[PDB]
Subunit: 451 residues, 3 copies
C-alpha cells in the first residue's frame, strides 16, 4: 500500500506512484573552520631520521597550504532556465572576505567548535572548528622541536600529527581537484558525526531534523562547498546543504514508450511517444516537473531531487495520465516516422516497444524465454520476469515490491491516419498536431474544392 | 591488414573499419564479503600514546561502519530507451536481505575466501572474503588490549591494523561518496589479483577467460557495485561485471561532416550531414548501432562498448556507406541552412568542412601550413599531418598505424536545388526529404497549372 | 570599471562584458618519469613484524606495477565538430615506444630531474624525474635486506619507503581508475611546485609565464595525462598542458530568455528566445563562440575556456546584441508555442520569464518579497536581491561587483502575429522565420486572390 505501478496502453506509458518527495526548496550555508598555523621555518642542525620525517610532514602541510593560497579563488527539458548553484556559498565567503569578520568568528569559536554567528550581511550562519592545527603545531612541536635539541625519539609524534593532518591535506587536495568547488563533499570536509550535529543544530523542523539527520547518503550529492578564506590563522570554507520546505508529499515517476501502427511494411510507419518522461512531485497545489532523470535520485521510497531542474505545472497535467486528448491541459508528445525497436524501464517492469521485426522476449533467470511479443507496444512486469531482450540488449527489471496494473485501451495512433501526417515533431503536443492536421486537410480540400 | 580507413566524399563521411568488438551482452554478479566485528567498547584507564593511536584507529573504523549502517539502500540518439543498470546487483543484494542467506554464505566462506554459492533466488553467484576484520580485531588486539594491562608497546600493532583497515575504510568512504553506487569500482572493493582470480574462476569460455582476465583497464568503466548488507558480522557488497557473449567480430566507427554548396554568398547556403556518427558492431547477423560516442571506449585495435545504448539495425544499413540513395534502407541525415566552418576527427584522419571563409589549413609540428583548402569538404590523413586549424581551433590527429582511402564522388548536395528545400531537418532521411520535395514540387506546379 | 552587465529587453537577453579571455589555442606535452625498480624477489627465512611490513610494502608496490603493466596503453551547439583530445599525449607516448628513445631520456635526466630533450619525432619536449624508486629500493633496502640477516629493526625505514611510494601507488591507481586517461591530473602525477617550475621552464612568454604559473586551480581541468611506457626501469607518462596564444582580450557571456505575447489565455501563446547563450571571446579579429557553457570556466574576472567547443563567428555577430533585425548577420533564435515560467542567471542578476500565471518574486534574505512581476519578460539585478522564486524554484543571484544597465525596448514578439506563425523552430533565425512567414502569406493570399 506504499508503492505500485500502473501502465496505460492508451498512450503507452508507465507511472510509478510510490516514492515520497524530498525537494530542496531552500538552501543553508555553514562556514566550517580549521585553526591553521603560520609555522616559523623549522631548523635542526643535525639530521635524525625521525626529525626528517617530522620535517617532511611539516613540508607536506606547507605545500598543502601553498596550493590552497594559490587556489583562494584569486525531447522536452531544454527550457528550464539554469541557476547559479554556488551563489550562496561564495556570497557568504565574500562576506567573510571583509577584513573584520574573521576575528569575530575566531573569537566566537575560541571555546567550542560549533556556534551560530551573524555575519556582516545579516543572514545568520552556523560555523564549526573541526580540526585544530594551532594546538598540535604550537604546543606539541615547538617546545619539542628546539633549534639544536631536536630530541624527537618519540616516533608516535609523527603518527599523531599525520592523523590530525591528513584531513586538511585531503581538504586542500579536493580544493585543487575540483576547482575549489566539489560535489559531493568528502568526509574530510565534514565528518559524518559532525554532519549529524550540524543537522540537529540548524533551524529546521523536528520531523525535518530527523529526516535530514538520517539521510546523509544523498545530501552530499545535493551539497556543495567552495573555499572562503585563509585570512588569519584559519582555513574557512563554506558548505551548502538543503532545506526541505516540501516533505511528506506522495510523488511519482513517468516513463514513456512509442505508439505506432503495425503495418507489415518496415518503412512508411507512423510513431508517437509521450515526451514528458521524468518526475512529478507535489509541493504547493501544482506539480513539479523534472524533465531529465539526471536531476533526481532514489532511496527505497524517498526520492531526493533538486528543484532547479523543475518547472511548476498545473495539477490538471495529472489528467494527461488518463486522457491525453482532454483540452484542459495540452499534453506534450513527439512524433516520428522511423520504425525501430526498443524498451524502457518502469519501477516494477519494462515496456517493450517491439517495432520492426526484432525478436523481443521476456524471461526469468532460471526459466528462459517465457513470453514472446508481436510487433507493438506491450508491457511486462517484474513479478516473474527479470530479463527482457530486444534486438541484442538484455535489460534487467528492478525487483522492488509492488502491485502492477495494466489499463487496456486503443492507442491514439489508430486515430491518426497516414498520407497527411507531418513526419517531424519533437516539441509537439495534441493541440499542435491537431491544428497542423486540420491545416493540411483544409489545404487539400480547398485545392480540390476549387475545381 | 588489421585497421585502416576510408572516407567517402559522396556524403562527406569517414569510416574506421579496424576495431574488434567487445560487447557486454551479458551481466554477472559477485557478492564480495569482508568479515566485520561488533567490537566491544574499548577501555583503558591510563593513557599511553600508542594506546591512544589504537583507540583512534578503532574509532575511525567505528565511524566507517556507522556510515555503512546509515547508508542502507533498499541528431539521432534520443529514441534508444534507457535501462536499469543497478537492477541485477541490488536484486542480488535484496536476495541477501533475506535473513537466512548470510549465515549460509558465511559458512560456505569459513575455510577459503572464494566459492560458488547458490542464493535463495536460484541464480548461482560467486563470493569472496578478501579482507578479514574479525581475526585481527579478536585474537590479535583483544587478548593484548586488556582493560587495565594495555601493554601495547609494540608499535607495529597499529601499523598492521591500519594496513588491514584502510581497505574497508575506503570501501565505506566510496559507499558515502557515490550514493553507495559507484563506477568505476576502486581496488579496495576488489584487489587486482582477486579480480584476475574472479575472472578465471567464473563460468565463461577459456578464450573469454583469457580475454577479460587480461582486459582489466576498461572493465571497471563497465563494472558496477552497490552495497548489499552488513547483516551479521560481515560487510557484503555486490559487483556487476560484463559477460562478452559476442566477441571476435570486426566492428567499425562512423564520423560525419556536412555537405554544402559553395556559393560565394555566405548566406542562403544549403547544408546536409550524415546524422549517423557513432559505432557499428556486428553480433547476430545485424549490426549494433551506438549513436553517441560516450557509450563506447577504445584501447588499441579492440573497442569495448556497452550495449544499453545500442539498437539492432539491418545489415543493409552498411550499404548506407556506399550509396546513401539506395532504397533498401532509408539512410538518416540532417539538413540545415547555417554556413559555418568546422572539422571532425576519425581514427586515421581529419575531415575539414571548411565553410564560410575561415582560413583552414593542414600542417605538421615541424612544417606548419603545408596544405590550404577551399570552401568545402576536404579530407586529410594522419600520415604527414598532425595539426589542422579551422578558424582558431587547432586540432591534433591520432597517429595510429593505418592505410587511408579517399573515394571521390559528386556530393549529393549538388542534386538538391535551392528555392524549394526546407531549411529545418534533423531527424530527416533520404526518403523523408524526397517526399517533402515531391510535396513542394506538386504544390508549386499545381498552383501554376490551374491558371 | 572592470565588469558590468547590460540586459536588452528587445530580445530578452543579458550580456556580462567584464571577463578576460584565457584560450588554450596551443597544446604542450611533457613526459614525466619516475625511476622504477626491477626488484629481485625478497627473501627472509624467519618472520619479524618489521620484516613482514617491509615485505607487504614491497608487494603493494609489485601489485601497483602489475596494474601498470596490464594497463600498458596498447538549441545550437550540435555542429561544432569534435576533436581528438588525447592525440598529442598518446602520440608522444608512441614516439617513446620506439626502442631507443627511453635510454636517451633516462641519460638526459641522470644528473638532474628536469631537462628539455628532442624526441625521435623532432618536436622537443620537457621531462622530469620527480620520484626515484631505484635509489631507495637499491641502496637502502638490498644492503639491509640480506637473505638471512634481515635486521631491519629501524621502524622508520617503512615510513620513509611508504612516503616515497604512495605517490607512485596513487599514480598507478589513477591509471587504473580513469582508463589510464584522467582529467584533472592529481598532484601525485605532478607536484604543485614541480608544476610551477615546469611553467617557468617551458617555452612561453614572460607575461604568459607568470599568467600560467599563478593559475594552477583551473589548468588541471584543462590538463590531460595518459600512460606512455614502463620500458626500462622507469615509469613514463605524458602530461598535456595549455598554451595561451590568445590572452589580454576582453570577453563576455551571453544569457538568454524567451519573449512572448501576454494574452490572458494560457494556450495559443507565441514565444521566442535567443538560442545563442554561451561564451564570446575575441582572439583574431573575429569572435569565438562556445555554445554550451560546459566548455568554459570562471575565476574572478577571468574566464578560462577550451576552444575545441568553439567556432569563429564574424565580429558582426556582436551587432546581434543591439539589433537582432540587422541583415548583416542572421541572428539565431528559437520559436515555440509552449507557455511556461522560468528564469535564467547572468553574471550580476537574473532574467525572469514569468509566463503563464506563476507567482514570480524577487526578494532579499532579510527583506522577503520586495518585487512582484506581471506576466512577461522582466529582469532583476543582484544589488538588493538574492532570492528570485518562480513557481516553486528559489534561485540565488551571484553577488559580484558590477553596474547593471537595463535597455528598454518593445519585444520583437510584438511584430510577429499569430494565426500564421509556425509553432516549431529551434535552429531557426530571423531570416529563416521571415522567409517562412512570407511564404505563408503568399500562399494564403494567392489562394484567396485566385477567386
Ligand atoms: C470544418 C471544421 O470542422 N473546422 C474545424 C475548425 O472550425 C476548428 O477550429 C478546428 C479545431 O477544432 O477543427 C476543424
Ligand atoms: C508578397 C511579399 O511579401 N513579398 C516579399 C518579397 O517581395 C521580398 O523579396 C521578400 C524578401 O524576403 O519578402 C516577401
Ligand atoms: C517524386 O516524384 C514523383 C512526383 O511526380 C512522385 O510520384 C514520386 O513518387 C517521387 N519520387 C520519385 C519520383 O523518386
Amino acid at each position: 500500500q506504499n508503492i505500485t505501478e500502473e501502465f496505460y496502453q492508451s498512450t503507452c506509458s508507465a507511472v510509478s506512484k510510490g516514492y515520497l518527495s524530498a525537494l530542496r526548496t531552500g538552501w543553508y550555508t555553514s562556514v566550517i573552520t580549521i585553526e591553521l598555523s603560520n609555522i616559523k621555518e623549522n631548523k635542526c642542525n643535525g639530521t635524525d631520521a625521525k626529525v626528517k620525517l617530522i620535517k617532511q610532514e611539516l613540508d607536506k602541510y606547507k605545500n598543502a597550504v601553498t596550493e590552497l593560497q594559490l587556489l583562494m579563488q584569486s525531447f522536452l527539458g531544454f527550457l528550464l532556465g539554469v541557476g547559479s548553484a554556488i551563489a550562496s556559498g561564495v556570497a557568504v565567503c565574500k562576506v567573510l572576505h571583509l577584513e573584520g569578520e574573521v576575528n569575530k568568528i575566531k573569537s566566537a569559536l575560541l571555546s567550542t567548535n560549533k556556534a551560530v554567528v551573524s555575519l556582516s550581511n545579516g543572514v545568520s550562519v552556523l560555523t564549526f572548528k573541526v580540526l585544530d592545527l594551532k594546538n598540535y603545531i604550537d604546543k606539541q612541536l615547538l617546545p619539542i622541536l628546539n633549534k639544536q635539541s631536536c630530541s624527537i625519539s618519540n616516533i608516535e609524534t609523527v603518527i599523531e600529527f599525520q592523523q590530525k593532518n591528513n584531513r586538511l591535506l585531503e581538504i586542500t587536495r579536493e580544493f585543487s581537484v575540483n576547482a575549489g568547488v566539489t560535489t559531493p563533499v568528502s568526509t574530510y570536509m565534514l565528518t559524518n558525526s559532525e554532519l549529524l550535529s550540524l543537522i540537529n543544530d540548524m533551524p529546521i523542523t523536528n520531523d525535518q531534523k530527523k529526516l535530514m539527520s538520517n539521510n546523509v547518503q544523498i545530501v552530499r550529492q545535493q551539497s556543495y562547498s567552495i573555499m572562503c578564506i585563509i585570512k588569519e590563522e584559519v582555513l574557512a570554507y563554506v558548505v551548502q546543504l538543503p532545506l526541505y520546505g516540501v516533505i511528506d508529499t506522495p510523488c511519482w515517476k513517468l516513463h514513456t514508450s512509442p505508439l505506432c501502427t503495425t503495418n507489415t511494411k518496415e518503412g512508411s510507419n507512423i510513431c508517437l511517444t509521450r515526451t514528458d518522461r521524468g518526475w512529478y512531485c507535489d509541493n504547493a497545489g501544482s506539480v513539479s516537473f523534472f524533465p531529465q532523470a539526471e536531476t533526481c535520485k532514489v532511496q527505497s521510497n524517498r526520492v531526493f531531487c533538486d528543484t532547479m531542474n523543475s518547472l511548476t505545472l498545473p495539477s490538471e497535467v495529472n489528467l494527461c495520465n488518463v486522457d491525453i486528448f482532454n483540452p484542459k491541459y495540452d499534453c506534450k508528445i513527439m512524433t516520428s516516422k522511423t520504425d525501430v525497436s526498443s524498451s524502457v524501464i518502469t519501477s516494477l517492469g519494462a515496456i517493450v516497444s517491439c517495432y520492426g521485426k526484432t525478436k523481443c522476449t521476456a524471461s526469468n533467470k532460471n526459466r528462459g524465454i517465457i513470453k514472446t511479443f508481436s510487433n507493438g507496444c506491450d508491457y511486462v512486469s517484474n513479478k516473474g520476469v527479470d530479463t527482457v531482450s530486444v534486438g541484442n540488449t538484455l535489460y534487467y527489471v528492478n525487483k522492488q515490491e509492488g502491485k502492477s496494473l495494466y489499463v487496456k485501451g486503443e492507442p491514439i495512433i489508430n486515430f491518426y491516419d497516414p498520407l497527411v501526417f507531418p513526419s517531424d515533431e519533437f516539441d509537439a503536443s495534441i493541440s499542435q498536431v491537431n491544428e497542423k492536421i486540420n491545416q493540411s486537410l483544409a489545404f487539400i480540400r480547398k485545392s480540390d474544392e476549387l475545381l
